[model samples]
Target: SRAEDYEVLYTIGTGSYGRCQKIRRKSDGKILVWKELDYGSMTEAEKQMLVSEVNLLRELKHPNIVRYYDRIIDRTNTTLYIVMEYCEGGDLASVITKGTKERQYLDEEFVLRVMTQLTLALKECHRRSLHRDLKPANVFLDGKQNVKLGDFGLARILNHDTSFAKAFVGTPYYMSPEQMNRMSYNEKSDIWSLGCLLYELCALMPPFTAFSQKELAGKIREGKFRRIPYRYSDELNEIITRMLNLKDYHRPSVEEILENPLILEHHHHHH
Candidate 1:
């Protein structure tokens, strides 16, 4: 029964060693998305990392995050097939990049709306013991502009208090200070990445613009950031500054940020 229940319609995305396809359950006629990873192409080390990702996603359950529906290990080839939610809308990188070409930026209101959603989502991640690998390409939006945080491939549970996660895992544009150096890090690392996202949202580029990886890492370590002039009284910039404070402990927590005056100021939308 399980053997003949699914059929792939077409591929949605193609990554390094695998492809994601739109699939359907023949028995229930339920449409789904599946990512098939070829074991033959992946080394044992890669498989271990992939398994970690799978386990991480399975434990992470939230509305603003993509849901993991199913996973399977192929007996014959030792391959893995992961079924996930089908998001019709693509990632935020596309949206922001396209907007830049047209000289149209997301308004302050829209940026706040997206931030609010992400704030809650990250709160969930923090509460559950994980840090998201924040990046524009990893954030998605549906038709109604509803945000979804996807791509948890680098996500890891807080197994140890000070794990020097040697993997340089996130996009360079959004890498935090500790992350760039492979230093022992924690949840506050995510806040730094969130700051980068906000900076990009307002300024249309990252805070620190560098020509090379070494230069970028050096800039990040030095806390080289531009002060967003208070031209707009949105207070979003102020919040971001506080959240990205050099001292990770000084950075605003998810709970604190949610209740921040800047964010709470937008409480009234109903007429």
Candidate 2:
């Protein structure tokens, strides 16, 4: 689709990648999230990574994942335009932040609802490839609070390691110990992030916290954090701890985790 066909509403997100905006398709007046990336300054290797991201987004069609709409390359110095569904309810990051600031909490049922949806979304991707980043900010929600995982492999795209350690300063909150060590990682990395996600649901903060990046990685390596409030079930605690296993091999896969009774029940109930 031509970029001219869409009307830009306003900027929704801005970061190192580029500008993100909420736009409307002029033909049908449908709203979407517009992500723009300029690759003129990038090498061929970096350009291919952006192409990979676009192709993967096109194929990942699970309802629990963000829907891809249209894509176009603007010829002037090479700007890539990627459009996807607009998540009306914003993202889980704000949900957690607001609740923590207000001292309000979502019920365990809400946590389970978000968790199961995210798990189902990951099922399709993990088989194809690793989703290197799986934090709350990457997870979106609709008006009905239906969860949709988005912004896949963003960290992977940035893995050319151009000051990556400092560029990802805040990411250690949801990072696994093995990842912290720069060891070989796989789907288990996502599980660890999932564990951090679950814990944040109950604790309203990441399981590991520190004032500095070095100290943060240290805490992650230690794998010690306060337990989630008992108000949430013991089952969640067990699952989170299991997912947060310090050893990557000890953690569960998406399919294996689907067998968990608590998750199983939630999964079946949606049908």
Candidate 3:
């Protein structure tokens, strides 16, 4: 179906290069997210990122990953529209921030639930590709609060023989030491970001704090971050510690993370 076939319901999100909105298909009234990017105003780099996002979304097929329905380039309108599954509960960032404002923190069980699903999602991505940008904002939730990893603009398909990728693009708060150093990095970088997400879920803020990029980079590079509080379980603290390991090689892989006692326990007990 064409872009005009969808009725705009409301704006859901905004980004550096585009805006996302909830829309309903006029033909069937099925709700979906319509990500509209202004092609004319975008630079070459931004255009390439858009293409990469669409191509990666097209190739990825997993229950934990967001569903991509269609892509339409309206040349006459100088816009690109990407139709994707509508996540009713919204992103993890919204859930966390709203809870914070309300003086309510996410409990361990809920955090574990999100972690379990996200682990499976990251495992799937690492098995087939690399989601370079792994953060709470990129993790969405369905009506039932199931984690659905989205926003693949920074993702890349890693070659089997050459696991490392060289790119200096990612959210600073969630970036790994290797990424900060602009060194070659692999799926382990995503693990570091996941650790940041885990910490944010528990503490309502990222592990590292800084007034400048240099300070933030220094903190990440030196593995300097506040310890997870005693209120959280020891297992949870240990898992986050391992994931946020400053040395890339020391960080656990997705497979290893699945075998973690905490993750295993959650997997067995929940669902």
> Which one is best on TM-score?
2
Candidate 2 residue spans exceeding 4 A from truth = 152-168, 264-271
Misplaced by over 4 Å in model 3 are: 41-53, 152-171, 264-271
Assess candidate 2 and give its TM-score to the true structure: 0.87
For candidate 2, the C-alpha RMSD (Å) to the true structure equals: 2.9
RMSD for each of the candidates: 5.5, 2.9, 5.8
Please state the error at residue 5 of candidate 1 in Å: 2.9
What is the RMSD, in Å, between candidate 1 and the native fold over all Cα? Answer: 5.5
Least lDDT summed over 10 consecutive residues: which range in candidate 2?
A: 154-163
Least accurate stretch of 10 residues (summed lDDT) in model 3?
A: 154-163
Q: Write the residue-wise lDDT of candidate 1 on 1-271 in tens digits.
A: 2435688899977754467788887878877777776566555675687677678888877767877888766768655677777666777788779878998766777677667778778888877764377788778765555677886553222211112342443237777777666676588888888888877877778888787778877777788687753444457878887767778888888787787665543531221
Using TM-score, rank the candidates from best to worst: 2, 3, 1
Return the TM-score for candidate 3, rounded to 2 decimals.
0.83
Cα TM-score per model = 0.79, 0.87, 0.83
Candidates 2 and 3 compared by lDDT, better number = 2
Question: Between candidates 2 and 3, which one is better according to TM-score?
Answer: 2
